[PDB]
Amino acid sequence: MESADLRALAKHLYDSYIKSFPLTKAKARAILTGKTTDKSPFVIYDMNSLMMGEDKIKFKHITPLKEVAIRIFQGCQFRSVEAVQEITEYAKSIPGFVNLDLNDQVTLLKYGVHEIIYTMLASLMNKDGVLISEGQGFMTREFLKSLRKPFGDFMEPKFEFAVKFNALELDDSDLAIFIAVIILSGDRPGLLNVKPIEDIQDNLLQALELQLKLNHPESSQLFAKLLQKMTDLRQIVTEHVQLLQVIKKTETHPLLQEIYKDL
Amino acid sequence: SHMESADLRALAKHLYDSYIKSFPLTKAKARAILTGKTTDKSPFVIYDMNSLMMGEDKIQSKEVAIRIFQGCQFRSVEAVQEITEYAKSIPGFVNLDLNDQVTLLKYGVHEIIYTMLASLMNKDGVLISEGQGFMTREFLKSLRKPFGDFMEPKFEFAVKFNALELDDSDLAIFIAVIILSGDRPGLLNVKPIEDIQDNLLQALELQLKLNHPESSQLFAKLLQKMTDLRQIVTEHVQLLQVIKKTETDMSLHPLLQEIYKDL
Ligand SMILES: CC[C@@H](NC(=O)c1ccc2c(c1)c(C)c(C)n2Cc1ccc(F)cc1F)c1ccccc1
């Protein structure tokens, strides 16, 4: 509607984005390049550095367990569950979300967290590795693909997406509106009242379009390129669940399986 | 109406919202079925062997006492899945050590099932089959030994617990307090667990004061009910040790077995 109101929505989403996500992209980019404050993350590049990292980095997912490739997949599921709760808190700050049907709120989050997890995973990724444990570590890309089959292929697609996605050079204020657009997708299966969802998303898309033009004046059709990335996000989520269904045939704890019943 | 009350009320609203999304049969719906004030919510009442056989196909050639006991396990296992889903929504729960998350769910899931079971109970019986059925207290008490002495401690607690007249918004915070118990055996980090419960205990005190202003010291009486919950769990595990050695042709559900392992 009003151009000034769209900037108010952009400022609101960014303020909530900071409160909901501790390790922002700006903080992650400072770690991946050097914030002139030392505190460089512990790098995991092989099996020996991984065993040293577990004795130094405070890992809160070390259950009595036997192969190494399972532990790494276990750690990435612990963080995923933490991420879902961060996204859920952020989704509640989107204007109009809490007023939606309660079943629709659950549906929008059920199918949206995966696409948001990979979107924000790109903020912690360069072409050589990904930050882990709130930025205290850095697991190299070569060490991830050196894992045995099929555990050596569940991160390479995210790297291929991140290197293309990070080329857009979006900051946290851009991602805050972009993440809100993904959550309010009116085409999620099982929605009961699509109209208010699309109404809010069309309002978020107007805010994102004005945000990208003011924050990236020299990027011609960046708004269009960012919408094309949403298509690539659903391709990986579909590709990941196919690899996830291969899992459950190899990892064969009852109470632990209920906490991680998804993803 | 200070700023501290704002966060406590926000925490109460968050938990109640997660409570509704995690449990499909709330106390409000349970009471609307039992009070019998409509026509579409009337349940089928099972009171003898005849009405038991009459109420079939409610959306094996086993013994009646065995078949009903097997049905209690499936609902218990399904309840563990719902409590596990609600636990992840408690702020800070998924950020704790993974072994502590399992330990809190291991010892907390019993005290919550019997707490919410009171919502489905009155003086004369308990709702079953998602509220479509209603099994009387005397029919369950008439089952062969020792299957007839399973539900009596639960009915006695429910009658005294329901006298507090708590609604779902009160139960949402009280259930969160039960999960974040820092006295569970085998915990690694008690300080982060006690910090979360102190916040939940603070939110429960304000919730009960605003929702039950005429009820004097309801917060103290609600906390004292933990003694009765512990007594039921102790009596329940003693009975299961009898069936384990008398009914060697059946076993508990694997998810239930892991909960009962050790303590
Ligand atoms: C803590 C786990 C504990 N579970 C119970 O003690 C229990 C018993 C009966 C319950 C319930 C919980 C609940 C939630 C309901 C609604 N019921 C009534 C009910 C519902 C459906 C039906 F088919 C028959 C019914 F009796 C348990 C552990 C191990 C083995 C068996 C049970």
Numbering used by the authors:
A (entry chain B): 206 to 270, 275 to 461, 466 to 476
B (entry chain A): 204 to 262, 273 to 476
How is this structure described in the published paper?
PPARγ is a ligand-modulated transcription factor belonging to the nuclear receptor superfamily. It forms a heterodimer with retinoid X receptor α (RXRα) to play key roles in metabolism and the maintenance of glucose homeostasis through modulating numerous target genes. Sequence analysis and crystallographic studies reveal that PPARγ displays the conserved nuclear receptor domain architecture, comprising of the activation function 1 domain essential for ligand-independent coregulator binding, a DNA binding domain (DBD), a hinge region, and a ligand binding domain (LBD). The LBD binds a number of endogenous ligands, as well as facilitating dimerisation with RXRα, and contains a regulatory activation function 2 (AF2) region which binds coregulators in a ligand-dependant manner.
Here we present an analogue of SR2067: SR1988, a non-acid partial agonist of PPARγ. SR1988 contains a central 2, 3-dimethylindole moiety flanked by a 2, 4-difluorobenzene and a hydrophobic phenylpropyl group with a terminal ethyl moiety joined by an amide linker. The asymmetric unit of the crystal was comprised of two LBD subunits with homodimeric architecture. SR1988 was bound in the ligand binding pocket of the LBD in a very similar way to a number of PPARγ agonists, wrapping around H3 to make contacts with residues of H12 as well as the β-sheet. The central amide of the ligand forms two hydrogen bonds with the receptor; the carbonyl accepting a hydrogen from Tyr327 of helix 5 over a distance of 3.3Å, and the amine donating a hydrogen to Ser289 of helix 3 in a 2.4Å hydrogen bond. The indole moiety of the ligand makes hydrophobic interactions with Cys285 (H3), Ile326 (H5) and Leu330 (H5), and the 2, 4-difluorobenzene interacts with Cys285 (H3), Arg288 (H3), and Ile341 (β-sheet). The phenylpropyl moiety forms hydrophobic interactions with Leu453 (H11) and Leu469 (H12). Previous structural studies have shown that rosiglitazone stabilises H12 through a network of hydrogen bonds mediated by the thiazolidinedione head group of rosiglitazone, which enables robust recruitment of coactivators through stabilisation of the ligand-dependant AF2 coactivator binding surface. This hydrogen bond network is lacking in SR1988, as there is a phenylpropyl group occupying this space near H12 instead of a thiazolidinedione, placing hydrophobic moieties in the pocket near the AF2. A reduced stabilisation of H12 as well as increased stabilisation of H3 and the β-sheet in comparison to rosiglitazone account for moderate, partial agonist like transactivation of PPARγ by SR1988.
